[PDB]
Design a protein around this ligand. Structure first.
Ligand SMILES: NC(=O)C1=CN([C@@H]2O[C@H](COP(=O)(O)OP(=O)(O)OC[C@H]3O[C@@H](n4cnc5c(N)ncnc54)[C@H](OP(=O)(O)O)[C@@H]3O)[C@@H](O)[C@H]2O)C=CC1
Ligand SMILES: NC(=O)C1=CN([C@@H]2O[C@H](COP(=O)(O)OP(=O)(O)OC[C@H]3O[C@@H](n4cnc5c(N)ncnc54)[C@H](OP(=O)(O)O)[C@@H]3O)[C@@H](O)[C@H]2O)C=CC1
Ligand SMILES: CN(Cc1cnc2nc(N)nc(N)c2n1)c1ccc(C(=O)N[C@@H](CCC(=O)O)C(=O)O)cc1
Ligand SMILES: CN(Cc1cnc2nc(N)nc(N)c2n1)c1ccc(C(=O)N[C@@H](CCC(=O)O)C(=O)O)cc1
Ligand SMILES: Nc1nc2[nH]cc(Cc3ccc(C(=O)NCc4ccccc4C(=O)O)cc3)c2c(=O)[nH]1
Ligand SMILES: Nc1nc2[nH]cc(Cc3ccc(C(=O)NCc4ccccc4C(=O)O)cc3)c2c(=O)[nH]1
Ligand SMILES: O=c1[nH]c(=O)n([C@H]2C[C@H](O)[C@@H](COP(=O)(O)O)O2)cc1F
Ligand SMILES: O=c1[nH]c(=O)n([C@H]2C[C@H](O)[C@@H](COP(=O)(O)O)O2)cc1F
Lengths: 506, 506
């Protein structure tokens, strides 16, 4: 009685694994994974058995795999004994004889095709599933991996990797069949109430924890966003704010995201990537004219830039969509005397973005690559104070550009998915203009909150198991950072869950 | 063969447990801990046995403890059978008969005095130790808890709690005698090099991990600082900077500290608390005259305010210790045109500190309680750009004041212990002036680094197991935040390890 594991690489949506007797992709690192996972043994005097169907045995050229015993399931192949590393059985059930005897076999791996996968699960022989989810769907398949039965639960989901602009994951499914420290902490939590800080940071209940079966393997960095939602639903204090919509709030949180092998665009909800870009280039160009976003069919700043909103906050003399000195005016003209959105500001103020770019390539190990938007002198003139307040950038020794952002207030339903993708794109733009590669993205949050009208929507999003992050590549190398256009951005392999509508609080 | 655990409350340094037949303190929550830990059982048809010496049996008034069987070790007490909850044995060894039979006893607790503790460890009967470290040392003891033998290792250390301005810890010592996920992550780490983000955030090796036996119980929030040192020693990239002393650096880190039940002043090194306060009030008063710190025997700003340093960075015409517009000038006179440190700036600039205090008590749930020091217009005039760059404040529903700080550059050997305590004091000052209680402190760090001349010292500090945090209380309620004096601060129960000398890089 030893372990039996399925190893498979299937597409993210339809679970396709083959086409015309071969794989529908060529991912070198996935083969190395297959090699290392099937050679993984504990006894040096034992080998692992790899069960596969005849057509898969043809796919690998009918040649043995080093340090392993291949078991071919076939009704016609001669039960040859010349090759000791290849053995043939007439059916899958009889081939599980590696359990009954043959103590020289330690582990068993089911590597075969659709036929072998389908009746290995139907016969209930499989204990574990090693799934490699590949983000390729608009191609043709003729061989599929069967649907994983409900008796299996995911226990691990790796970060998103990239090969030839193809995103892929690594997951482990398992079939469902110290205490003195946990008790001591519980007892101290009964004595001290909220005086024990752990009781103010309670672990999220299972009913609000995304994919709860993955306990020790939440490597996918979309969990950095989904677990923050769970922590707010668990510990968020009901609080009123300047809008009529109250929130559940906590203070002091952070999220990490990789940008080397993926792009942190959420997959549990379809995110409007075009509106994010058009706002970011709007900041970079130094623009505060709210109409230029509306002319490009981007209405995210309509609520905070209406005549009724501006008159209520004390800016009745301001034009309709004149947002005042905000992001992109403190970026390019810091401390510049603001007039209107129509005046010419070329020359006035401190151009932080230009000095940032010049410093990134002239003194990379400098510890002052800082871009700020919090200007106490201009706060009164703003339609809304900056939420992403200050950001720092860092050049690694292997010529990668990382980014840190402090966010004073974070709408986790709407602003946060935008902020994650926006500062990811900005770091990639700065990386290309400065001749670096994208690094990491960290977001430090002050008031992380959830508006009460987003509760049903965000709980729906928590019911969706994440998919691998997409890729984002630029089609051309610009000379100045302002020259980026939406046509220059290619979003490769993005298969999100359906969009979720959420109303913004004005 | 069941479990035998010691429950004891001893002082932090000398391990004193008694004086004149009673406890040298009165901590109510510690008694509740003793009650809940000794009543903790798994079988409802079984009781726990509490072994204690005769003098301890006298200390509790010779009355039984509810739901438990008290076992008194005495050579003279009559082996009475009238009370079924109290039984007498002639020696400690015979009383361990609860192991041989008496299946109605589930767990055994050694609660007695020094005599019972000493030969319960000498006789090698004890499996676990529940230690309550109390921060009281300048009093008199006549009964001590013996030194814990090397066969025990700590596995848990709680946060610091407070009762009547007395700090105390809860520790667990234990006597020394899924795999598929760990392997899958290891194999993916062999395939991808630094492409897998986990490989850029490697867990610290045991040789650089403070108190390595505490794996799942690192609750004491001084580990938030000690584990950051370990992560830098593990993943820090060797990098050159504006000083001749290179550092080992990582980007994007954070630390949490409680301020409700303790004051986050490090115990693994004696920290100059007076210099921290005198610098903070120097900031609050709006002062940039470096001589006012030297006149009070505080020399932390001497290096960045010398004639040779100022002439080297391009401020040769600046006076000796004229640091320019820095912390406390952007606090009290933001965007104010700076001349020298002798001129009068009352009225010029934006007084952030006043607007912060006014906003904290007039609009507590406001999400804009922000204090910044990053002024791109004044960076060139500064003797050194701000390291603690921006801080945000937050009022909880139970009227506590929390603080978040973003630090662009963090000298983990010198500045970081100062930054942790300084912004803790500032948050407490703002809390008293605004009528709140201290909350939590979170520090988000950009360039966390260790100077190479601090390696021997910081490794020495990592060899010291932390002690409970002290308390910091104000002696009087001031009317204005500027009126705080060093005499107004009371540091209660601070017993640190000896100070460690580390030279500052200019
Ligand atoms: N992405 C991935 O991880 C993998 C993809 N693939 C791909 O899938 C395709 C191959 O899969 P598939 O088309 O299903 O072919 P199979 O690999 O499943 O092989 C089928 C053969 O196995 C034998 N067989 C199957 N079931 C039985 C049975 N119940 N009793 C006796 N013999 C049986 C038969 O051999 P016979 O006719 O001789 O009797 C049958 O023709 C290829 O494109 C391959 O590249 C394959 C493996 C992994
Ligand atoms: N902080 C804490 O957690 C605790 C503190 N304490 C404090 O410690 C003090 C008391 O401890 P302590 O002074 O050591 O006295 P003890 O509680 O250890 O009691 C000693 C008595 O136990 C009996 N005894 C001890 N050893 C033996 C033996 N080898 N064979 C037979 N009988 C033995 C003797 O009783 P007899 O003379 O009758 O034969 C002896 O006088 C008090 O101040 C108490 O408050 C006590 C418990 C816990
Ligand atoms: C056609 N086929 C089936 C195949 C392909 N990809 C998969 N990918 C996964 N994740 N799981 C599978 N079961 C799987 N099976 C193949 C193809 C090549 C090798 C192979 O050459 N393996 C070498 C590895 C070669 C190298 O290291 O790159 C080994 O040592 O195991 C195995 C199976
Ligand atoms: C003198 N003495 C010994 C004593 C005192 N403090 C300790 N503190 C610790 N952490 N550990 C000990 N073994 C310990 N022992 C005492 C004193 C009172 C009670 C006691 O009354 N316990 C009640 C608790 C009372 C309450 O809940 O406040 C119980 O039900 O267990 C026990 C032991
Ligand atoms: N309270 C508050 N005030 C704020 N001011 C400015 C912002 C930024 C912002 C403002 C509005 C949005 C927004 O509605 N997107 C719509 C959308 C959501 C999900 C999926 C797709 C789409 C889509 O684009 O179709 C996003 C971001 C902001 C905020 O988020 N909250
Ligand atoms: N590189 C670099 N440049 C910087 N400029 C300004 C600072 C702030 C600072 C500057 C200097 C110190 C400092 O030496 N304390 C000495 C000390 C350390 C431990 C215990 C006691 C004592 C004590 O004798 O009182 C601390 C803090 C700073 C820095 O920390 N690093
Ligand atoms: O980029 C943004 N991200 C974001 O989360 N918000 C949300 C946070 C909060 O819900 C609101 C600001 O409200 P307040 O100014 O009161 O903190 O804007 C706004 C942005 F522009
Ligand atoms: O409060 C402070 N905290 C701190 O960490 N430094 C250190 C960080 C860095 O090692 C050094 C120089 O800053 P820079 O990165 O601009 O060279 O000052 C200085 C302070 F004043």
């Amino acid at each position: 009685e030893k372990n039996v594991s399925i190893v498979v690489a299937a597409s993210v949506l339809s679970s396709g694994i083959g086409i015309n007797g071969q794989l529908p992709w060529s991912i070198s690192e996935d083969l190395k994974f297959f090699s290392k996972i099937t050679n993984n043994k504990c006894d040096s005097n034992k080998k692992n058995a790899l069960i596969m169907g005849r057509k898969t045995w043809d796919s690998i050229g009918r040649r043995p795999l080093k340090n392993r015993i291949i078991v071919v399931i076939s009704s016609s192949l001669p039960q040859d004994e010349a090759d000791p590393n290849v053995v043939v059985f007439r059916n899958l059930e009889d081939s599980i004889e590696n359990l009954m005897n043959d103590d020289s076999i330690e582990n068993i791996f089911v590597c075969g095709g659709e036929s072998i996968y389908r009746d290995a699960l139907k016969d209930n022989f499989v204990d574990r599933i090693y799934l490699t989810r590949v983000a390729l769907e608009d191609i043709e398949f003729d061989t599929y991996f069967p649907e994983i039965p409900e008796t299996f639960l995911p226990v691990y989901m790796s970060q998103t990797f990239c090969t030839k602009n193809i995103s892929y994951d690594f997951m482990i499914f398992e079939k469902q069949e110290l205490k003195s420290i946990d008790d001591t902490v519980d007892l101290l939590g009964e004595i001290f109430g909220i005086r024990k800080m752990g009781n103010r940071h309670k672990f999220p209940k299972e009913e609000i924890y995304n994919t709860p079966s993955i306990r020790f393997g939440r490597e996918h960095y979309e969990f950095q966003y989904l677990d923050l939602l769970s922590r707010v639903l668990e510990n968020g204090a009901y609080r009123e704010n300047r809008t009529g919509i109250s929130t559940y709030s906590i203070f002091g949180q952070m999220m990490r995201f990789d940008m080397r092998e993926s792009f942190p665009l959420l997959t549990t909800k379809k995110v409007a990537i075009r509106s994010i870009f058009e706002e970011l280039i709007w900041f970079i160009k130094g623009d505060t004219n709210g109409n230029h976003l509306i002319e490009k069919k981007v209405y995210i700043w309509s609520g905070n830039g209406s005549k009724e909103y501006l008159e209520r906050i004390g800016l009745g003399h301001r034009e309709e969509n004149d947002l005042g000195p905000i992001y992109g005016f403190q970026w390019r003209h810091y401390n510049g005397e603001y007039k209107t959105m129509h005046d010419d500001y070329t020359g006035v103020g401190v151009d932080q973005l230009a000095k940032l770019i010049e410093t990134l390539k002239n003194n990379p190990k400098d510890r002052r690559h800082i871009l700020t938007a919090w200007n106490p002198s201009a706060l009164s003139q703003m339609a809304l104070p900056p939420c992403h307040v200050l950001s720092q950038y860092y050049v690694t020794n292997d010529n990668c550009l990382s980014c840190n952002l402090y966010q004073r207030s974070c709408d986790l339903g709407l602003g946060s998915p935008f902020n994650i993708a926006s500062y990811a794109i900005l770091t990639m733009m700065l990386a290309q203009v400065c001749g670096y590669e994208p690094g990491e993205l960290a977001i430090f949050i002050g008031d992380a909150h959830i508006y009460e009208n987003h509760l049903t929507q965000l709980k729906e999003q928590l019911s969706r198991t994440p998919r691998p992050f997409p890729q984002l590549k630029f089609k051309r190398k610009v000379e100045n950072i302002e020259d980026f256009k939406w046509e220059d951005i290619e979003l490769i392999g993005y298969y999100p869950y359906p969009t979720i509508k959420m109303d913004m609080a004005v």
